[PDB]
Amino acid sequence: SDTHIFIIMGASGDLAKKKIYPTIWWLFRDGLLPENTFIVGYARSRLTVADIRKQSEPFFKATPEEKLKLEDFFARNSYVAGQYDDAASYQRLNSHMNALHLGSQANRLFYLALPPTVYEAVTKNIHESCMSQIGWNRIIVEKPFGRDLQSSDRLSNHISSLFREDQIYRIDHYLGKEMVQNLMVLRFANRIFGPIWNRDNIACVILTFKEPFGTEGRGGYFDEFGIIRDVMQNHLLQMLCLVAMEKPASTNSDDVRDEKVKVLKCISEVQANNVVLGQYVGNPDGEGEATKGYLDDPTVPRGSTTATFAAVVLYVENERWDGVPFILRCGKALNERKAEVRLQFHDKRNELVIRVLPDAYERLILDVFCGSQMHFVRSDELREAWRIFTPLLHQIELEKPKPIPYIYGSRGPTEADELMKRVGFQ
Amino acid sequence: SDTHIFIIMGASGDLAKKKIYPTIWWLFRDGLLPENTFIVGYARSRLTVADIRKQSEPFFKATPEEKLKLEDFFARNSYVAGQYDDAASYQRLNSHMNALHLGSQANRLFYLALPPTVYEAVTKNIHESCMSQIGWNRIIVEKPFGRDLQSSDRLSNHISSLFREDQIYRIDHYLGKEMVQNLMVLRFANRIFGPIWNRDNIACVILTFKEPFGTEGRGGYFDEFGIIRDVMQNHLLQMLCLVAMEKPASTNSDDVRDEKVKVLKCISEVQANNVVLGQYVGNPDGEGEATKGYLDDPTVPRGSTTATFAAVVLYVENERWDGVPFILRCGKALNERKAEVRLQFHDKRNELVIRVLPDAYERLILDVFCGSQMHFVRSDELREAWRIFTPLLHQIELEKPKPIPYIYGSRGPTEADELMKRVGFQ
Numbered sequence: 001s002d003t004h005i006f007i008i009m010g011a012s013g014d015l016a017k018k019k020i021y022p023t024i025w026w027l028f029r030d031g032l033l034p035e036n037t038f039i040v041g042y043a044r045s046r047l048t049v050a051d052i053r054k055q056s057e058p059f060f061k062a063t064p065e066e067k068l069k070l071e072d073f074f075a076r077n078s079y080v081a082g083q084y085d086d087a088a089s090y091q092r093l094n095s096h097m098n099a100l101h102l103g104s105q106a107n108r109l110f111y112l113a114l115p116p117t118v119y120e121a122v123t124k125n126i127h128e129s130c131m132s133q134i135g136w137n138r139i140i141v142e143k144p145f146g147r148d149l150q151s152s153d154r155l156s157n158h159i160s161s162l163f164r165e166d167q168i169y170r171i172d173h174y175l176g177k178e179m180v181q182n183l184m185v186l187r188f189a190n191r192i193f194g195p196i197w198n199r200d201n202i203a204c205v206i207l208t209f210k211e212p213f214g215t216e217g218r219g220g221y222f223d224e225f226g227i228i229r230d231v232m233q234n235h236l237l238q239m240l241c242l243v244a245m246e247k248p249a250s251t252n253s254d255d256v257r258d259e260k261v262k263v264l265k266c267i268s269e270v271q272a273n274n275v276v277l278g279q280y281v282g283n284p285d286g287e288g289e290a291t292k293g294y295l296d297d298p299t300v301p302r303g304s305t306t307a308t309f310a311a312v313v314l315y316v317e318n319e320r321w322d323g324v325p326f327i328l329r330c331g332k333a334l335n336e337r338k339a340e341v342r343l344q345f346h347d348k349r350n351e352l353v354i355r356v357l358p359d360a361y362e363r364l365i366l367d368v369f370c371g372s373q374m375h376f377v378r379s380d381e382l383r384e385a386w387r388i389f390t391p392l393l394h395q396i397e398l399e400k401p402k403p404i405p406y407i408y409g410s411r412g413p414t415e416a417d418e419l420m421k422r423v424g425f426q
Numbered sequence: 427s428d429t430h431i432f433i434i435m436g437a438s439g440d441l442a443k444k445k446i447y448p449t450i451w452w453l454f455r456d457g458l459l460p461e462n463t464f465i466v467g468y469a470r471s472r473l474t475v476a477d478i479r480k481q482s483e484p485f486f487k488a489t490p491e492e493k494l495k496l497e498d499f500f501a502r503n504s505y506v507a508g509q510y511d512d513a514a515s516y517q518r519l520n521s522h523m524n525a526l527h528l529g530s531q532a533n534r535l536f537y538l539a540l541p542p543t544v545y546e547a548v549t550k551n552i553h554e555s556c557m558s559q560i561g562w563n564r565i566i567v568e569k570p571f572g573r574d575l576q577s578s579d580r581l582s583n584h585i586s587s588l589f590r591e592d593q594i595y596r597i598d599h600y601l602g603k604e605m606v607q608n609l610m611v612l613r614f615a616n617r618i619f620g621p622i623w624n625r626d627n628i629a630c631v632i633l634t635f636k637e638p639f640g641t642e643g644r645g646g647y648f649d650e651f652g653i654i655r656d657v658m659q660n661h662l663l664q665m666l667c668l669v670a671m672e673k674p675a676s677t678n679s680d681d682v683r684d685e686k687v688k689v690l691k692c693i694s695e696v697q698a699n700n701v702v703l704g705q706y707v708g709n710p711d712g713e714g715e716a717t718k719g720y721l722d723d724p725t726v727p728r729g730s731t732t733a734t735f736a737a738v739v740l741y742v743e744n745e746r747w748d749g750v751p752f753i754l755r756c757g758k759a760l761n762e763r764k765a766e767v768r769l770q771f772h773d774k775r776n777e778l779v780i781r782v783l784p785d786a787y788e789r790l791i792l793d794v795f796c797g798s799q800m801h802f803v804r805s806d807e808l809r810e811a812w813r814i815f816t817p818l819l820h821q822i823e824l825e826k827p828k829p830i831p832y833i834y835g836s837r838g839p840t841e842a843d844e845l846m847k848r849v850g851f852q
């Protein structure tokens with residue numbers, strides 16, 4: 001229809017006031033939201049809309065001449081309070097949404113801006129209380145999608161036992177304002193260079209994600225993940241899929257995601273001999289945040305063996321690719337801010353390099369509004385990535401191997417380049 | 427065999443003392459010449475080897491410790507004097523070559539460092555006087571290979587009436603020390619991206635040759651050619667061939683040159699509507715040779731309509747390429763020193779970019795020594811390029827259209843970009 005309700009499960013946290021309210025503001029200001037779109041937040045802290053405004057207007061970049069549009073925006077805003085496992089609270093939320101103009105028939109988009117530890121509760125109550133009877137119901141879940149195959153499997157099974165896959169939207173948007181253009185141009189490259197990309201012409205493919213900045217006083221949150229769960233298992237693996245995939249049956253989201261799943265189902269579990277881990281130490285001669293290392297961050301626990309750099313070799317095992325090594329190299333606190341995919345050819349060796357107005361996160365919100373699931377990891381697709389990376393992560397958490405120390409600013413630990421050479425790179 | 431004689435027809439000119447003596451020195455110093463190689467020069471001016479040495483040693487970059495190798499080098503040197511159409515002079519040359527150690531059986535490589543106006547004479551006398559009876563005989567001819575289809579045809583017919591094609595080596599080496607790597611990597615790219623390069627995936631191909639420097643006090647020699655005869659008709663057309671060619675039957679020089687000829691035989695004669703010509707004027711705000719324009723060069727005749735920039739659209743007409751425009755854009759005195767080939771794809775539009783120890787000219791001398799004709803335009807291949815570009819050049823010399831004036835440092839006359847847009851570039 002034409003009436004939409006944007007439920008924000010958790011308006012009192014960072015992601016709410018720092019981004020999603022600003023981003024929805026930015027889409028409304030530019031006339032990109034549906035004309036009949038209400039924004040309804042919901043958390044336990046009792047507070048007025050004006051409190052959200054006083055504590056989240058700084059981040060809007062508002063200018064005096066455009067503020068009347070903002071007044072209409074906040075007329076669209078409303079907020080109610082309640083618990084996350086209180087049936088009466090969800091009933092109050094549902095009745096308040098029904099009270100809005102045409103809220104009975106309206107589409108409902110639930111953004112779970114909550115720590116996944118409460119998801120099991122929320123997804124339940126919504127399912128039995130707040131789902132629309134006429135319009136569609138789409139839920140946006142947030143990272144982490146578990147931390148291993150078992151936890152991710154239990155969470156995804158719980159969520160998919162209540163919502164069809166065309167209602168589950170797993171969003172990921174923390175690696176740059178050009179995050180969607182990456183996958184878009186990589187899909188275009190797979191559609192163009194489809195016939196060339198075989199084991200006959202290519203000897204090795206690499207996928208690189210370098211960042212020049214460290215954790216920057218926030219290594220405490222990064223310490224509970226690791227560089228494998230933060231960059232590799234989700235994004236680099238998705239672009240590996242996009243590189244190695246077959247020609248899709250069409251341009252539907254589900255067909256290309258089927259091809260990505262088919263690619264993932266051919267990658268065996270990575271083992272430690274094909275893995276090089278590294279941790280960045282403070283640069284003695286640099287200045288600024290360059291002087292501090294990973295362990296010099298106060299939020300990082302002492303003795304942390306968490307890797308902030310990883311080089312991993314995977315192999316797609318079919319007829320198109322066999323023995324062709326896919327080298328995923330990523331790392332915080334490096335020499336450049338580079339995100340590229342280089343395919344080296346069977347012959348100095350020659351290689352093809354693929355380097356990178358709706359801006360990423362906004363593009364993603366608009367995809368869930370229109371309904372295109374193109375860029376969201378699908379539930380069965382995730383299980384395969386977690387299967388690939390789970391034994392290695394269990395081994396790392398069990399044995400806790402000391403990551404190779406590398407100097408802040410270096411390209412990486414020399415063992416990574418040695419690993420590349422062992423498999424056949426030069 | 428093992429004995430070689432390097433005849434240099436014309437040791438008293440620039441190309442002799444500035445390059446070919448230095449280059450052969452550089453190949454001997456590095457042990458790249460055959461061990462039994464004699465260097466024998468020949469021109470009308472009577473002079474000793476020591477005069478060539480006193481006037482060409484500056485250009486050798488000799489260092490005190492390496493000069494004993496140079497003494498052996500000049501022991502290999504010798505020189506005789508005579509006319510270019512005097513039978514007795516060529517008889518003296520032949521007897522002197524026979525006098526050398528094993529000179530009767532030795533291979534003979536004739537380098538015609540002479541203005542082509544005497545070629546007809548030289549190539550005759552050699553054919554009847556100085557060709558070896560046991561070893562091979564290879565002649566290196568030099569630009570210009572004529573100036574239109576008729577003159578080039580008469581010259582090539584005269585030369586090929588005396589020497590087989592595996593004896594004629596048309597050398598071209600004035601556009602950079604990386605001139606051979608260009609064609610090498612372009613051949614590799616054709617062998618790799620063969621299946622992709624069709625009219626289905628590609629909408630437009632461009633081939634760019636930009637130079638940031640002007641004529642630099644030597645516009646008098648450039649004025650008799652034009653930018654079409656200096657860059658486009660020879661080099662850019664060769665790399666167009668290398669891009670659009672089919673898969674060769676093997677890796678022989680003659681098979682790939684057959685493919686290049688097959689490509690050339692499908693390009694019709696270019697007409698003025700697909701041509702944009704430009705002449706560089708002095709930059710008022712720049713400094714140095716930037717202040718002077720093309721007409722400010724004293725060696726340039728007043729009122730010269732010679733084009734120093736050209737943008738030309740050609741079309742290969744077969745089944746692999748049809749309606750696919752090949753845009754050859756070249757120009758002296760520009761913004762960058764760039765030599766690239768960009769293939770634009772059928773969709774912002776995406777494009778594939780191909781940009782560029784034996785160093786070019788040395789690599790070429792070594793190819794004629796070993797005998798690989800890979801990088802030398804073959805006699806039947808040249809005729810096709812001259813056929814393509816002859817009507818346009820006749821029209822330019824007849825009507826003398828004033829080239830579009832463009833500012834020194836600009837990308838080029840706006841009419842070139844307009845021409846690109848007319849054919850379908852964006």
Ligand SMILES: NC(=O)c1ccc[n+]([C@@H]2O[C@H](COP(=O)([O-])OP(=O)(O)OC[C@H]3O[C@@H](n4cnc5c(N)ncnc54)[C@H](OP(=O)(O)O)[C@@H]3O)[C@@H](O)[C@H]2O)c1
Pocket residue numbers: 010011012013014015016043044045084112113114115116117118142143144174
């Ligand atoms: N790179 C990443 O992976 C990344 C980065 C940023 C955010 N995120 C995800 O984004 C989501 C939003 O989190 P946030 O960082 O923006 O802020 P947040 O403080 O984690 O959560 C926002 C709201 O959640 C409720 N909440 C927090 N902890 C709770 C608990 N233990 N029990 C019940 N309710 C609780 C509170 O609402 P009330 O107290 O008002 O009820 C709080 O204001 C999280 O799921 C987080 O994982 C991920």
Ligand SMILES: NC(=O)c1ccc[n+]([C@@H]2O[C@H](COP(=O)([O-])OP(=O)(O)OC[C@H]3O[C@@H](n4cnc5c(N)ncnc54)[C@H](OP(=O)(O)O)[C@@H]3O)[C@@H](O)[C@H]2O)c1
Pocket residue numbers: 436437438439440441442469470471510538539540541542543544568569570600
């Ligand atoms: N970009 C280009 O196209 C380019 C650039 C450089 C050179 N070249 C070619 O390289 C070749 C070498 O020429 P160069 O520039 O190095 O010097 P050059 O002075 O043209 O020729 C060298 C020798 O040729 C003889 N010679 C010159 N004009 C003659 C004439 N009208 N009749 C008879 N003999 C004559 C003289 O020998 P003696 O007086 O001792 O007998 C002279 O020392 C030429 O064919 C030229 O076209 C081309």
